[PDB]
Amino acid sequence: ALAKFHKKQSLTKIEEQVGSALVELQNTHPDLKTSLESIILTQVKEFQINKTNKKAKSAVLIYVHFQSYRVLLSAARKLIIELEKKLKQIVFFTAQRKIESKWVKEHKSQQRPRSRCLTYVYDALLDDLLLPSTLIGKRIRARLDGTSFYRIQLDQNDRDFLEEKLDAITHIYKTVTTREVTFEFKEDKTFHTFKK
RNA sequence: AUAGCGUAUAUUAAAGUUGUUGCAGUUAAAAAGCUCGUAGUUGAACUUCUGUUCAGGUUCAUUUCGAUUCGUCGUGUGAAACU
Ligand SMILES: [Mg+2]
């Protein structure tokens, strides 16, 4: 539907499927009705995960308007499950973040809130992708020359949902951001006082 | 030392013997008996990171090319970084 979009002009074959696909789920499943009623879309981008295997395995990332970001996270799990079943493609939800300029300030009486800065915006997606579960440890490495590798620590109990998307994420990030992102699984680090 | 050479006095260096650079401070001189406290001096971390490609030189490297000589240029790569 052009309904579930903000620009409301024209959609792309991908964006279109996503629209009806969404409208589908709120009619089909009674539970996602409430949440999906709310959800609006900003834009959707498709990315090809090209591996040396000459295999074409694509997935698509969808930009949920910030207004519905709360809601999007509220049912995030179930939503992505159905969208992947109903589109046979890998699905990722992000927030539509607007980045502010560093030196291009123009409104004398306007300060650039850190909330919308490049470090913080680009760092956002990573949380968004692995979505269902947020990371435990994040790190940076400086290869001699000057590369920066982000080996990120992911929870063990989530090996399911995250192991698969794992390659897509890497590839979407390298495209949007510019950051190489390798992951590493570590058993969760429960630190409490076991007391028998 | 030598048509020059002593002497007296102030002053420079030796003086890291007045010290920003660059001193010392248990016992050699030197931490105050001890706390509060405005001047003064001193202050944590975040905000385009980054990538791709083109180009100009720069350098450096060279199982290497063309020129010249009593030591330079041009060409190619890679690389870095600049721009
Ligand atoms: Mg004498």
Short mmCIF file of C-alpha atoms (C1' of nucleotides) and ligand atoms in Angstrom, two decimals:
data_model
loop_
_atom_site.label_atom_id
_atom_site.label_comp_id
_atom_site.label_asym_id
_atom_site.label_seq_id
_atom_site.Cartn_x
_atom_site.Cartn_y
_atom_site.Cartn_z
CA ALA A 1 0.00 0.00 0.00
CA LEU A 2 1.11 3.59 -0.65
CA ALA A 3 -0.66 3.85 2.67
CA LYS A 4 2.17 2.40 4.72
CA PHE A 5 4.76 4.91 3.42
CA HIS A 6 5.57 8.58 3.99
CA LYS A 7 6.60 9.92 0.58
CA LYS A 8 3.57 8.12 -0.90
CA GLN A 9 4.72 8.80 -4.48
CA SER A 10 5.78 5.57 -6.20
CA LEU A 11 7.36 2.40 -4.77
CA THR A 12 10.00 0.05 -6.17
CA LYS A 13 9.18 -3.57 -6.97
CA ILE A 14 10.87 -4.28 -3.62
CA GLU A 15 9.15 -1.45 -1.76
CA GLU A 16 5.78 -2.49 -3.25
CA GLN A 17 5.99 -6.13 -2.11
CA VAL A 18 6.97 -4.87 1.31
CA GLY A 19 3.89 -2.63 1.40
CA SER A 20 1.28 -5.25 0.57
CA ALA A 21 3.35 -7.74 2.58
CA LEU A 22 2.88 -5.60 5.67
CA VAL A 23 -0.77 -4.88 5.01
CA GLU A 24 -1.04 -8.66 4.62
CA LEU A 25 0.21 -9.55 8.10
CA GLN A 26 -2.14 -7.19 9.98
CA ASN A 27 -5.12 -8.78 8.19
CA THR A 28 -3.82 -12.33 8.54
CA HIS A 29 -2.50 -12.26 12.13
CA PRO A 30 -4.61 -10.53 14.84
CA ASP A 31 -1.63 -9.87 17.13
CA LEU A 32 0.43 -7.77 14.70
CA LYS A 33 -2.70 -5.79 13.95
CA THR A 34 -2.20 -3.33 16.82
CA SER A 35 1.54 -2.82 16.18
CA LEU A 36 1.41 -2.81 12.38
CA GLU A 37 -1.52 -0.42 12.49
CA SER A 38 1.08 2.02 13.80
CA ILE A 39 4.10 1.14 11.65
CA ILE A 40 4.91 3.46 8.74
CA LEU A 41 7.77 3.09 6.28
CA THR A 42 10.30 5.63 5.05
CA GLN A 43 12.13 3.77 2.36
CA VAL A 44 13.44 0.27 1.65
CA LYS A 45 16.81 -0.81 0.21
CA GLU A 46 17.77 -4.11 -1.33
CA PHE A 47 21.32 -5.46 -1.18
CA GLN A 48 22.97 -8.44 -2.90
CA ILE A 49 25.17 -10.71 -0.79
CA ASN A 50 27.72 -11.82 -3.35
CA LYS A 51 29.92 -14.65 -2.11
CA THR A 52 32.71 -16.34 -4.13
CA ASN A 53 30.29 -19.28 -4.58
CA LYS A 54 28.79 -17.46 -7.60
CA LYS A 55 25.60 -17.75 -5.53
CA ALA A 56 23.12 -14.87 -5.53
CA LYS A 57 21.68 -14.52 -2.01
CA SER A 58 19.88 -11.23 -1.43
CA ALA A 59 18.20 -9.59 1.51
CA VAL A 60 16.43 -6.28 2.12
CA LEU A 61 16.68 -3.61 4.80
CA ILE A 62 13.64 -1.49 5.61
CA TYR A 63 13.62 2.03 7.07
CA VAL A 64 10.86 2.44 9.66
CA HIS A 65 9.96 6.07 10.33
CA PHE A 66 11.24 7.26 13.67
CA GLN A 67 7.72 7.89 14.94
CA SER A 68 7.04 4.16 14.82
CA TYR A 69 10.46 3.14 16.06
CA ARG A 70 9.06 2.39 19.51
CA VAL A 71 6.41 0.08 18.09
CA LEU A 72 8.83 -1.50 15.60
CA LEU A 73 10.92 -2.69 18.48
CA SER A 74 7.86 -3.78 20.42
CA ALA A 75 7.13 -6.70 18.05
CA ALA A 76 10.38 -6.70 16.07
CA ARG A 77 10.91 -10.44 16.56
CA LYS A 78 7.67 -11.79 15.17
CA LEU A 79 7.55 -9.16 12.44
CA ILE A 80 10.82 -10.15 10.85
CA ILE A 81 9.93 -13.85 11.08
CA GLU A 82 6.77 -13.43 8.99
CA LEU A 83 8.37 -10.99 6.57
CA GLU A 84 11.11 -13.47 5.75
CA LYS A 85 8.60 -16.30 5.33
CA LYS A 86 6.44 -14.04 3.13
CA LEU A 87 9.27 -12.63 1.01
CA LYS A 88 11.87 -15.39 1.04
CA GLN A 89 14.56 -12.76 1.63
CA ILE A 90 16.57 -11.61 4.64
CA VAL A 91 14.93 -8.73 6.54
CA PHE A 92 16.44 -5.87 8.58
CA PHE A 93 14.71 -2.89 10.19
CA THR A 94 16.43 0.46 10.89
CA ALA A 95 15.32 3.85 12.06
CA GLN A 96 15.28 6.70 9.56
CA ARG A 97 18.09 8.77 11.06
CA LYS A 98 19.02 12.18 9.72
CA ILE A 99 22.67 13.17 10.09
CA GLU A 100 23.67 16.76 10.84
CA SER A 101 26.76 18.46 9.35
CA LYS A 102 29.97 19.19 11.20
CA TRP A 103 31.13 22.49 9.79
CA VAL A 104 28.07 23.39 7.76
CA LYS A 105 26.15 24.93 10.64
CA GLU A 106 23.87 27.69 9.36
CA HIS A 107 21.24 28.39 12.06
CA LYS A 108 23.14 30.69 14.48
CA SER A 109 20.67 29.84 17.21
CA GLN A 110 20.83 26.09 16.61
CA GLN A 111 23.13 23.53 18.22
CA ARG A 112 23.75 20.15 16.61
CA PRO A 113 22.46 17.59 19.14
CA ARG A 114 24.81 14.63 19.42
CA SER A 115 21.81 12.36 18.87
CA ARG A 116 22.14 12.93 15.12
CA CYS A 117 25.94 12.88 14.53
CA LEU A 118 27.78 10.52 12.20
CA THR A 119 29.50 8.52 14.92
CA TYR A 120 26.21 7.93 16.73
CA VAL A 121 24.06 7.42 13.66
CA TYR A 122 26.29 4.91 11.92
CA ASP A 123 26.82 3.19 15.26
CA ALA A 124 23.07 2.90 15.44
CA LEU A 125 22.53 0.45 12.58
CA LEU A 126 24.58 -2.22 14.22
CA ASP A 127 22.21 -2.29 17.17
CA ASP A 128 19.29 -2.22 14.71
CA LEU A 129 20.44 -5.14 12.56
CA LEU A 130 21.27 -7.72 15.18
CA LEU A 131 18.01 -6.24 16.50
CA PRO A 132 16.21 -9.04 18.42
CA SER A 133 19.35 -9.25 20.61
CA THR A 134 21.79 -6.47 21.44
CA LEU A 135 25.53 -7.08 21.58
CA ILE A 136 27.61 -7.70 24.70
CA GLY A 137 31.02 -6.43 23.62
CA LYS A 138 32.15 -4.02 20.93
CA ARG A 139 35.77 -3.49 19.91
CA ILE A 140 38.11 -1.79 17.45
CA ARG A 141 41.44 -2.99 16.07
CA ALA A 142 44.05 -1.06 14.08
CA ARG A 143 45.77 -3.23 11.53
CA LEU A 144 49.26 -1.89 10.93
CA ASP A 145 48.64 -0.04 7.68
CA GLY A 146 45.53 1.66 9.06
CA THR A 147 42.43 -0.50 8.81
CA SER A 148 39.87 -0.55 11.62
CA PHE A 149 38.16 -3.89 12.30
CA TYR A 150 35.06 -4.05 14.49
CA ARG A 151 34.94 -7.47 16.06
CA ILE A 152 31.61 -7.43 17.87
CA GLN A 153 30.57 -9.69 20.72
CA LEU A 154 27.26 -11.41 20.24
CA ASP A 155 25.27 -13.32 22.84
CA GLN A 156 25.34 -17.12 22.66
CA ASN A 157 21.63 -17.78 23.31
CA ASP A 158 20.90 -15.89 20.07
CA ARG A 159 23.16 -17.94 17.77
CA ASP A 160 19.95 -18.87 15.96
CA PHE A 161 18.54 -15.69 14.49
CA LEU A 162 21.89 -13.94 14.31
CA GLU A 163 24.14 -16.60 12.78
CA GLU A 164 22.37 -16.43 9.43
CA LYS A 165 21.94 -12.69 8.95
CA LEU A 166 25.57 -12.44 10.08
CA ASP A 167 26.96 -12.07 6.51
CA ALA A 168 24.23 -9.80 5.26
CA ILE A 169 24.79 -7.39 8.12
CA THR A 170 28.51 -7.27 7.46
CA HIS A 171 27.79 -6.50 3.85
CA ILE A 172 25.09 -3.91 4.46
CA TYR A 173 27.30 -2.09 6.94
CA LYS A 174 30.28 -2.02 4.55
CA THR A 175 27.88 -0.40 2.11
CA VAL A 176 26.21 2.20 4.30
CA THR A 177 28.90 2.87 6.84
CA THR A 178 32.27 1.75 5.46
CA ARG A 179 33.19 -0.43 8.37
CA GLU A 180 34.48 -4.03 8.20
CA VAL A 181 32.47 -5.83 10.85
CA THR A 182 33.46 -9.31 11.98
CA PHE A 183 31.49 -10.95 14.73
CA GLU A 184 32.48 -13.35 17.49
CA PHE A 185 30.18 -15.40 19.69
CA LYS A 186 30.87 -15.57 23.42
CA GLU A 187 28.79 -17.39 26.00
CA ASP A 188 26.86 -14.72 27.91
CA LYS A 189 28.76 -13.27 30.85
CA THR A 190 26.35 -13.78 33.77
CA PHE A 191 28.24 -12.32 36.74
CA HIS A 192 25.87 -12.84 39.66
CA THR A 193 26.47 -14.49 43.04
CA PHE A 194 25.42 -18.11 42.52
CA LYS A 195 24.41 -19.20 46.00
CA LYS A 196 23.55 -22.87 46.56
"C1'" A B 1 101.93 35.92 25.44
"C1'" U B 2 105.14 38.98 22.40
"C1'" A B 3 105.22 45.56 20.11
"C1'" G B 4 103.35 44.33 23.55
"C1'" C B 5 102.66 42.12 28.87
"C1'" G B 6 101.35 42.90 34.19
"C1'" U B 7 97.82 45.21 37.87
"C1'" A B 8 92.95 47.36 40.26
"C1'" U B 9 87.71 47.63 39.83
"C1'" A B 10 82.54 46.57 37.49
"C1'" U B 11 80.86 43.17 34.40
"C1'" U B 12 80.18 37.79 30.72
"C1'" A B 13 81.26 32.85 30.64
"C1'" A B 14 82.72 28.63 33.45
"C1'" A B 15 77.62 28.98 37.34
"C1'" G B 16 72.40 22.91 36.06
"C1'" U B 17 76.16 28.46 42.15
"C1'" U B 18 69.38 31.75 40.98
"C1'" G B 19 67.49 26.49 37.16
"C1'" U B 20 61.30 28.47 31.98
"C1'" U B 21 65.06 24.68 29.18
"C1'" G B 22 67.86 23.11 34.20
"C1'" C B 23 68.84 22.69 40.23
"C1'" A B 24 68.16 21.35 45.18
"C1'" G B 25 64.62 20.41 50.00
"C1'" U B 26 65.37 12.52 55.41
"C1'" U B 27 70.37 12.99 57.28
"C1'" A B 28 74.62 18.10 53.85
"C1'" A B 29 70.93 24.81 53.71
"C1'" A B 30 65.97 23.80 52.90
"C1'" A B 31 57.88 20.72 53.96
"C1'" A B 32 55.24 25.02 56.81
"C1'" G B 33 52.67 21.36 63.42
"C1'" C B 34 47.90 20.77 61.42
"C1'" U B 35 42.96 21.50 58.58
"C1'" C B 36 39.36 25.05 56.12
"C1'" G B 37 39.42 28.39 52.40
"C1'" U B 38 37.94 33.56 47.69
"C1'" A B 39 42.53 35.58 44.44
"C1'" G B 40 46.19 32.48 41.29
"C1'" U B 41 47.53 28.17 38.89
"C1'" U B 42 45.54 23.21 36.80
"C1'" G B 43 41.46 20.37 34.87
"C1'" A B 44 38.27 13.41 32.47
"C1'" A B 45 35.79 11.39 28.03
"C1'" C B 46 31.76 11.69 23.03
"C1'" U B 47 30.11 15.27 18.12
"C1'" U B 48 32.20 13.17 9.42
"C1'" C B 49 34.90 8.35 11.95
"C1'" U B 50 35.39 5.96 6.91
"C1'" G B 51 35.36 3.96 2.08
"C1'" U B 52 35.78 4.14 -3.47
"C1'" U B 53 37.83 6.37 -7.66
"C1'" C B 54 40.58 10.32 -10.43
"C1'" A B 55 44.30 13.63 -10.66
"C1'" G B 56 49.10 16.77 -9.51
"C1'" G B 57 53.39 16.17 -7.64
"C1'" U B 58 56.88 13.76 -3.21
"C1'" U B 59 59.42 10.34 -1.87
"C1'" C B 60 61.27 5.76 -1.20
"C1'" A B 61 61.93 0.93 -3.28
"C1'" U B 62 63.38 -1.47 -7.61
"C1'" U B 63 65.72 -9.87 -10.13
"C1'" U B 64 64.20 -2.45 -15.08
"C1'" C B 65 64.05 0.94 -19.19
"C1'" G B 66 66.09 5.60 -22.42
"C1'" A B 67 70.11 10.04 -21.56
"C1'" U B 68 74.48 12.26 -19.47
"C1'" U B 69 79.14 11.56 -17.13
"C1'" C B 70 82.51 12.39 -13.52
"C1'" G B 71 76.75 13.25 -11.25
"C1'" U B 72 71.66 14.09 -12.95
"C1'" C B 73 66.94 13.20 -15.89
"C1'" G B 74 62.96 10.69 -17.85
"C1'" U B 75 59.62 5.80 -17.39
"C1'" G B 76 57.22 1.91 -15.04
"C1'" U B 77 55.59 -0.50 -10.35
"C1'" G B 78 54.55 -0.65 -5.47
"C1'" A B 79 53.78 2.36 -1.31
"C1'" A B 80 52.67 6.15 1.76
"C1'" A B 81 50.99 10.46 2.64
"C1'" C B 82 49.93 15.23 0.85
"C1'" U B 83 47.08 17.61 -1.86
MG MG C 1 96.30 36.52 33.01
#
